[PDB]
C-alpha cells in the first residue's frame, strides 16, 4: 500500500529531472531509505547513483542547513 | 574478449560441416584466440589476478578437449596442431 | 562602541567547560564569557548554573555597546546550550534565529583510543 514511481513509467532517470527528484531527499540534504518511501529494490540503486551524479553538477548541495 | 564478428568468422571458417557449433575442433580455436587476447591483457595489466584464474580454467578445459580428440583420431589431432600452431 | 545593535551570539560547550561570545553579523567580537573566568573551578563548569551567569556577564558588556537583536549558534553538544538560551532571553534580547551547527566529518581522520576505565 506504499508509495512508488513505477506507475508513471520514468524508464530512464535522464540525469536532469531534478524537479521530480525532490521527492527522495530531505531538508537537511539526505536520502529517505526504502523504509520511508517504499520504492523498489533496483529503483533505489538507480535513484541513488542518479542523485550522486546530481550532487556534483550543482543541482543539489551536500550541506543544506542555511 | 572477442566480439561476435571475429567469433562468427572463426567458428565457421574452421567448422567441420553445416550446423557445427559444438564439434570440439571448433572450441579449441575459439579458446585459442580467447587465451591469446587474455594473455595480452595479462601482459598489459600484471596484477589483474581475478581474470588469471579464468585463464587457468580456459587452458585446462582446452587441454581436456585436446586430449579427448587424440583418443579418437590421431590424424585429426595432428592436422589441427599443424594447422592451429600449438603443442610444443 | 558604534551601536551595531544587531548581532549573533555563539555558544561553545564541552563536557567540562563552556564559552559564550556575543559577536556581530560578521561575527567580529564584542565580548566573551567563560565558566572558568567567573570564578568556578574543577568539574562545576559543566552544569548550566555557570551558563546563566556567563550569559549575564556577556550581555551586560554587550548592550553597553548597544544591542537589540541576537541569533543563536550552538556547538559542542552537552549540557550548556540547554539553559544558555533561556537565560540569554532574560536580560533583554531579541532571539530570533536558533541553529545547532556541529563540526561533523564524513569519516576523515581517526578518533583516539578508548578509555579502559
Amino acid at each position: 500500500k506504499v508509495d512508488y514511481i513505477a506507475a508513471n513509467h520514468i524508464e530512464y532517470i535522464d540525469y536532469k529531472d531534478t524537479e521530480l527528484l525532490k521527492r527522495f531527499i530531505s531538508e537537511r540534504g539526505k536520502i529517505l531509505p526504502r523504509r520511508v518511501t517504499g520504492t523498489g529494490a533496483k529503483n533505489q540503486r538507480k535513484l541513488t547513483i542518479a542523485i550522486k551524479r546530481a550532487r556534483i553538477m550543482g543541482l543539489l548541495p551536500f550541506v543544506s542547513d542555511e | 574478449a572477442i566480439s561476435q564478428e571475429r567469433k562468427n568468422e572463426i567458428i565457421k571458417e574452421y567448422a567441420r560441416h553445416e550446423g557445427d557449433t559444438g564439434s570440439p575442433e571448433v572450441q579449441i580455436a575459439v579458446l585459442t584466440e580467447d587465451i591469446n587476447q587474455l594473455n595480452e591483457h595479462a601482459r598489459t595489466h600484471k596484477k589483474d589476478h581475478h581474470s588469471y584464474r579464468g585463464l587457468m580454467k580456459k587452458i585446462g578445459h582446452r587441454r581436456n578437449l585436446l586430449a579427448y580428440l587424440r583418443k579418437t583420431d590421431i590424424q585429426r589431432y595432428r592436422e589441427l596442431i599443424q594447422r592451429l600452431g600449438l603443442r610444443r | 562602541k558604534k551601536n551595531i545593535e544587531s548581532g549573533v551570539a555563539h555558544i561553545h560547550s564541552t563536557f567540562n567547560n563552556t564559552i559564550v561570545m556575543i559577536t556581530d553579523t560578521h561575527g567580529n567580537a564584542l565580548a566573551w564569557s567563560s565558566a572558568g573566568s567567573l570564578g568556578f573551578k574543577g568539574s562545576k563548569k559543566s552544569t548550566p548554573f555557570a551558563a546563566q551567569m556567563a550569559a549575564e556577564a556577556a550581555t551586560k558588556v554587550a548592550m553597553e555597546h548597544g544591542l537589540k537583536t541576537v541569533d543563536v549558534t550552538v556547538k559542542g553538544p552537552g549540557s550548556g546550550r540547554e539553559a544558555a538560551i533561556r537565560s540569554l532571553q532574560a536580560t533583554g534580547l531579541e532571539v530570533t534565529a536558533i541553529r545547532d551547527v556541529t563540526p561533523v566529518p564524513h569519516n576523515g581522520c581517526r578518533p583516539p583510543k578508548r578509555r579502559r576505565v
Partner: protein
C-alpha cells in the same frame, strides 16, 4: 556498434556572445577532428547553481551527443583540454541508455 557520450559542461555566464559560439564550435571541431561524430550539440539552460565554484553561483548549461568507437583518442584529449582551461568549469561524460 559505438557509444553515446553526453557532455554536460558548465559555461560561465560572464562571457561575451561570440565567446559562446566560438567556444562551442571549437570544441565541436576538436571532437570532429579525431574521428568522433557529434549529432546534436545545443545550449541547455541559464541556471543559478546550488553553490559556487569560485564565485560563479550562476551558469549556463550545455548538452552534446557524440557517437564514436572506443578506439579513438579525442575524448581523453577533450578531458585534457577541458581541465587546462578555465571558462569551462565541470563536465561529466555519461553513457546513454
Amino acid at each position: 556498434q559505438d557509444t553515446k557520450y553526453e557532455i554536460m559542461y558548465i559555461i560561465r555566464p560572464n562571457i561575451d556572445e561570440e565567446a559562446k559560439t566560438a567556444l562551442v564550435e571549437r570544441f565541436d571541431t576538436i571532437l570532429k577532428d579525431n574521428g568522433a561524430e557529434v549529432i546534436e550539440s545545443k545550449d541547455w539552460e541559464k541556471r543559478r547553481l546550488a553553490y559556487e565554484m569560485n564565485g560563479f553561483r550562476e551558469g549556463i548549461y550545455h548538452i552534446v551527443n557524440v557517437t564514436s568507437p572506443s578506439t579513438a583518442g579525442a575524448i581523453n584529449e577533450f578531458d585534457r583540454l577541458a581541465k587546462i582551461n578555465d571558462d569551462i568549469i565541470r563536465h561529466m561524460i555519461v553513457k546513454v541508455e
